[PDB]
């Protein structure tokens, strides 16, 4: 009763999890996971690019069937949609210029310009904790714009997923003179517990198939094989 084609929405400004190569094709760990799960599910899968903040609306409107886009499993989102089991762990952390004294605190940030991705958990955290209290929190339609405004000095800092920032910006030439500003920001309520496949709540059979495939590809070591392409550490977490 699975669809012949599972349509999977993703935002492509999140290397090494999801982005586009020079041909415009989807690449990254999210794509590898999604493709491998679909293979084991014996379904065709079609990737659909969209802005991050359009993913959950598109899912609810049935324009896509699933979201694989470093989508954090939060209490708040679970009131709207369902999730597969955890795909990998994710933390949030600030980045700023190398040498910056910036810390993820109100005192340190009050007066600064801080970029966040529209529709993200980081946007939610920053709006409640920082924007109300004077911090210029600027929301962006995609993370590419954020990095651009940061390196152009239009932003002083940016709050986003730690691993994506590290592997996709900081460890790349463009992020050479940038670094994490302070430790990971810990807030269980806002940031949730790793990422998962976002699904409509009533698609019970689809969720069971993703979950089965995920457990199996983890059990036979395929997960770790695919992960080693991008990461030299345990990206799954606990
Ligand atoms: N493909 C992306 N740009 N993903 C951003 C994910 C940010 C965060 N994990 C969230 O779920 O809100």
From Swiss-Prot:
The keyword Transport applies. CDD domains: PBP2_HisJ_LAO. Keywords: Amino-acid transport, Disulfide bond, Periplasm, Signal, Transport. The gene is argT. L-ornithine binds at residues 11, 69-70, 72, 77, 121, 161. Changing residue 70 to A: Decreases arginine and histidine binding affinity. This is Lysine/arginine/ornithine-binding periplasmic protein. Pfam families: SBP_bac_3. The complex is composed of two ATP-binding proteins (HisP), two transmembrane proteins (HisM and HisQ) and a solute-binding protein (ArgT). Has a bi-lobal structure. Contains two globular domains separated by a deep cleft wherein the ligand-binding site is located. L-lysine binds at residues 11, 70, 72, 77, 121. PANTHER family: LYSINE_ARGININE_ORNITHINE-BINDING PERIPLASMIC PROTEIN (PTHR35936:SF23), MEMBRANE-BOUND LYTIC MUREIN TRANSGLYCOSYLASE F (PTHR35936). One of its GO terms (molecular function) is amino acid binding. Changing residue 117 to Q: Does not affect ligand preference. Belongs to the bacterial solute-binding protein 3 family. It comes from Salmonella typhimurium (strain LT2 / SGSC1412 / ATCC 700720). Part of the ABC transporter complex HisPMQ-ArgT involved in lysine/arginine/ornithine transport. Binds lysine, arginine and ornithine. Can also bind histidine, with much lower affinity. Stimulates ATPase activity of HisP. GO terms for biological process: amino acid transport. GO terms for cellular component: outer membrane-bounded periplasmic space. Disulfide bonds join 38-45.
